[PDB]
Homo-oligomer: 516 residues x 2
């Protein structure tokens, strides 16, 4: 199979009238459909349950954006049976055939871009550009993994020949596994975590995050229309830990693909290490578990450029990103000029209902609001509040862009992932101390440096110990293919998404010799 | 750096007078050196302890091959401190420099081949050719990994470019880890498990198996002479669980490479999934955990060829291989002709002191002897004993080649890894039933089929679910580079030794973007 070389899907800026019109149209269609109910998807069919889950608009939480079915253990078991039944034949599809199926899915998703974006706006409180980036990244994962999977096709392994024998090594998929997806990128990461394993012949049971069950269902509409065989992909929205625990601990779950909090990731990894009664394999668990990401600025930087990148990085999608800049490390010569610019920019940010395309929408939920406000209370005891730090008026979960200064590097707000619009500013003596402070957290996901000094940039290239490092630009928005995404340390298992290496995680190798 | 293309080191057959002369001299010198004492190796120096460990000759266990120092927790901590200190600079060596160090180590090992083989003969009771194959495979691992490591050199990752930016992805080593090595290939697997991680910039603390401490020490003499910087490789012989438990559970151990029994492997994998107090990463654990390997023979096979391959696979090194044929699955038409040929061949096998170059030496220890003899008692009540089934006369741990037939597929002797010269023969109706039986164990390491029918061979290629499958030849003796070695299911984590993919297990990836 021959397709155009991979290119990233353009992110819509909505700078044209047509783009704005198209979005208004999509927002209207989505809200007219707020009454919809979305069942589970098991074995190629939509399957309803007695109990339901409600999804809320975080910009107006009295407004319901949809309802879904609610899976329990019985539905998880049915999905698992379906996934293994499907695996028996799906594994034997030619790679070309599986990759074409993905390409079809990407084409369908592209045709529904505005609808998915508008659903992100209403369901998880993304502004318009954040919503478009999310959907574009989802499309990218599908396009990229469809092509990358062909690099592993039968028989892909380079071996040394031996006289009088054929020696043939090749990759085979693992089996049925479970995907536990986040609320913050519920099209992009939801899709990537599913289609990567599926592309190479695995089957998947996907549990969406509770806050993003509607958009997850709409992604499953796309999978169904694309024509994935029954059991290949399954959709199990659920409340709390029931469904996830049941599957993670199950003797017949082959692998676990997880993106979310460290608390949950640590539990998953520990469980995956155990042999459940009757289990006949060593489980693989891939976890991406957040960050406490810093931007360093030194006295040689373009301070205006730095301030812009810091504000984008800290406050994009309300700081609810594993990649978000939650620490700003300033050398002495950079401190005042950069802090003054950051404050001037941040104080001009709009906050309001996501559909109005504000700089910040609401945080995602009452629980998220509670967590972020609690960290703000902690921060007032650790650092100096200089901007924001309060809830804004309205039932929507609106929190003001927040800055703490004079934060000790070992303060809770300088160590713990807040996942809200809260930036901690740390003053350091020089670039060496900046790196020391940057590295001294349990995490290692993203980081950035603003500097014109070549020796500082290259030193950071070697010693700023994060999986995704960026110089003189924002530290968020890793592009599929361009920036393999994944971290070090307690940021997870370094499963690099949007990279050739990702697919290898979902394969095992067989070596077959014939002596003639 | 440019060297000749990889070739496997020839396995000496000792058919020439030159080879016999050299081996006889090597054996005499090793024997004359019985009783020698070997310290620990920590931080680039030999370090002795008050306590000591004894290594016995399994052919004559009154004879002490040598003694070694005995590591406890304190020595383990010292080695870990040394390994981390070394890592800080070793990770920064150009790959070309590290690879040249390996090639030097391979050259030194090659010059000491006969000595190392003779040490295997006396310490673990390998006959001459089994000993030669073990040392040759060790040399191969060093030669192969030295070259393979260059395929990962800075900056090795294929990424999609982006306008106005440099995007550079590259691999970095993990840190300091622990190697827990087996007694059955205590030069080959000991060496492979250490030099693979070290090649790409990790540092290693190695615990040799108790029964094979002297030969582990001789491998370290080679590492020391080659000039590995202090702390890069460390040698910690120990008794029982102390050293291994301490390191596996340590918050500051980065990875664990293990080859041995399933029972220990399960414990290691479970422990690796836990976050020890203060630990700041998700541990990687690579485990190879044995097999219950079958050769299938159908009625179309060359029965003489099959019988010879079965006897080599079942009884080479007394069946003490993770790859050994412990099951012979015979279709109805193949049953009598193949069994009669196997029995006639096996009853002619010589058993005696390994120095005499018998077909079989002793099993490795008194405990191993006790275990194999216990399984023989269990076997007597499960199938029909038709050959051997007893200890032979002498102080050495000599067990007769043993065959049970009409063995139920779910019998303990058809399911559990005995790791001795005990073959279980299972009679089945046809090839489909043969495959079902072959697949119905918790393991998936090696397997074989003797058959002239193409459709049966290609069927097995697709459906005989083992990591290393061989047609019309023995199922043991996988060659580095030729046959990537590693299994499925409870045979471990499919870390394919002697393959390009092995080194990727010991690296993590960084992605660095500069916007100009
Ligand atoms: Na919601
Ligand atoms: Na011994």
């Amino acid at each position: 199979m021959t397709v155009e070389p991979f290119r990233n899907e353009p992110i819509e800026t909505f700078q044209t009238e047509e783009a704005r019109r198209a979005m208004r149209e999509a927002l209207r269609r989505v809200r007219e459909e707020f009454g919809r109910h979305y069942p589970l998807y098991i074995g190629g069919e939509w399957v309803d349950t007695k109990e339901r889950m409600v999804s809320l608009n975080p910009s107006a939480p009295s407004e319901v954006v949809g309802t879904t079915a609610k899976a329990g253990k019985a539905e998880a078991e049915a999905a698992l049976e379906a996934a293994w039944k499907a695996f028996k034949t799906w594994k034997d599809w030619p790679q070309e055939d599986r990759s074409r199926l993905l390409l079809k899915a990407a084409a369908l998703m592209r045709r529904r871009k505005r609808e998915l974006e508008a659903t992100l706006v209403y369901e998880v409180g993304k502004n318009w550009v954040e919503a478009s980036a999310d959907v574009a990244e989802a499309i990218d994962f599908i396009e990229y993994y469809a092509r990358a999977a062909l690099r592993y096709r039968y028989p892909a392994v380079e071996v040394v020949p031996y006289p009088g024998e054929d020696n043939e090594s090749f990759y085979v998929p693992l089996g049925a596994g479970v995907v536990i997806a986040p609320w913050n990128f519920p099209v992009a990461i939801f899709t990537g975590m599913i289609v990567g394993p599926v592309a190479v012949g695995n089957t998947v049971i996907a549990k969406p995050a509770e806050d993003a069950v509607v958009v997850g269902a709409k992604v499953f509409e796309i999978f169904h229309e694309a024509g994935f065989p029954p059991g290949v992909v399954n959709f199990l929205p659920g409340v709390g830990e029931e469904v996830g625990a049941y599957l993670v601990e199950h003797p017949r779950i082959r692998f676990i693909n997880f993106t979310g909090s460290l608390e949950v990731g640590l539990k998953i990894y520990e469980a995956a290490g155990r042999l459940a009664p009757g289990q006949t394999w060593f489980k693989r668990a891939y976890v991406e578990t957040g960050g406490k990401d810093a931007i360093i600025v030194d006295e040689t930087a373009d301070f205006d450029l730095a301030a812009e990148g810091v504000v984008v990085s800290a406050y994009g999608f309300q700081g609810q990103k594993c990649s978000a800049a939650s620490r700003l490390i300033l050398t002495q010569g950079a401190y005042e000029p950069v802090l003054e610019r950051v404050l001037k920019r941040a104080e001009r940010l709009s906050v309001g209902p996501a559909e109005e395309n504000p700089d910040l929408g609401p945080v995602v939920s009452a629980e998220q609001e509670r967590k972020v406000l609690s960290y703000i209370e902690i921060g007032k005891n650790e650092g100096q509040l200089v901007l924001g730090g309060k809830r804004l008026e309205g039932e929507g979960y609106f929190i003001a862009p927040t800055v703490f200064t004079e934060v000790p590097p070992k303060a809770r707000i300088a160590q713990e992932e807040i996942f809200g619009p809260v930036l901690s500013v740390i003053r350091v003596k020089d670039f060496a101390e900046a790196l020391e402070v940057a590295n001294d957290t349990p995490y290692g996901l993203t980081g950035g440096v603003y500097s014109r000094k070549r020796e500082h940039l290259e030193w950071a290239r070697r010693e700023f110990h994060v999986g995704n490092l960026y110089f003189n630009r924002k530290i968020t928005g890793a592009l599929v293919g361009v920036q393999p995404f994944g971290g070090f340390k307690l940021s997870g298992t370094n499963a690099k998404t949007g990279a050739l290496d990702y697919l290898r995680l979902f394969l095992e190798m067989k070596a077959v010799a014939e002596r003639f």
